[PDB]
């Protein structure tokens, strides 16, 4: 996250952190006690290690006790989840087993109803992602708030031309913005998930390249879909 802050210790108890032998690669949101949603293209660095779901973490590397390490016994990508487009970026893992929940890990209820966002709607977005240009990481989770972009002015010529489709949504970008390692983090609206972020054109801070994040509420049924698979 850019141009955040430290957010408060185990405040935003729905984050998990993606891992693979132990590495952040991405964020993710509980959303149910056996499930992460994450984004696809996280598992791009995978190949052939542990990857592993990190609850109850405000440090990375600080001993909390409500830390809990889960493995992951199947990762469900998006199944147009195309490397390198946009679209459709999203990944389902299901934890090894149910997690308890309690105020440090607690899921987060997602939009069902296919309706978008109002532009302007001040959104919260968290990760342990990079904290400048050059990639410093923070150990601490980092958290800002973002108001929603119209999607016209997001797909716009001088934004990200014809590529923004009804299934993606825009934050605004100006110094404050979601990096690398944010990822299949959350993007929260009046305490509702509305949206998991993704890289799109993978430019940190640019007021014309708005965030870009996978609009919940446009896979509803797709996410319905896969959690009765439990
Ligand atoms: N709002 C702009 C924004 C928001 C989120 C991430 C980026 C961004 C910037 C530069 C490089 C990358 C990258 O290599 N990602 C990656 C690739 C493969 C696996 C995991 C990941 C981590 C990840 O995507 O977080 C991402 C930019």
């Known amino acids: 996250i850019l141009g955040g802050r430290e957010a408060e210790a185990h405040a935003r108890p729905y984050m998990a952190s993606v891992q693979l032998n132990g590495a952040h690669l991405c964020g993710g949101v509980l959303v149910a006690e056996q499930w992460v949603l994450s984004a696809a293209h996280c598992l791009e660095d995978a190949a052939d290690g542990k990857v592993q779901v990190l609850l109850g973490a405000h440090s990375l590397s600080q001993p909390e006790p409500s830390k809990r390490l889960y493995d992951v016994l199947r990762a469900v990508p998006h199944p147009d989840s195309q490397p390198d487009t946009i679209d459709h970026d999203l990944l389902?893992?299901?934890?090894?087993?149910?997690?308890?929940?309690?105020?440090?890990?607690?899921?987060?209820?997602?939009?069902?109803?296919?309706?978008?966002?109002?532009?302007?709607?001040?959104?919260?977005?968290?990760?342990?992602?990079?904290?400048?240009?050059?990639?410093?990481?923070?150990?601490?989770?980092?958290?800002?708030?973002?108001?929603?972009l119209d999607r016209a002015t997001c797909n716009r010529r001088t934004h990200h031309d014809g590529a923004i489709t009804e299934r993606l949504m825009c934050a605004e970008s100006n110094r404050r913005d979601s990096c690398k390692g944010d990822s299949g983090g959350p993007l929260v609206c009046g305490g509702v998930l509305e949206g998991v972020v993704t890289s799109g054109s993978r430019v940190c801070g640019n007021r014309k390249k708005p965030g870009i994040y996978t609009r919940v509420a446009s896979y509803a049924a797709w996410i319905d879909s896969v959690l009765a698979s439990a």
């Open 92 to 148: 389902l893992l299901q934890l090894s087993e149910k997690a308890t929940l309690g105020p440090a890990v607690r899921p987060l209820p997602w939009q069902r109803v296919d309706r978008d966002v109002a532009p302007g709607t001040l959104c919260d977005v968290a990760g342990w992602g990079i904290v400048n240009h050059a990639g410093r990481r923070p150990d601490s989770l980092q958290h800002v708030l973002l108001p929603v």
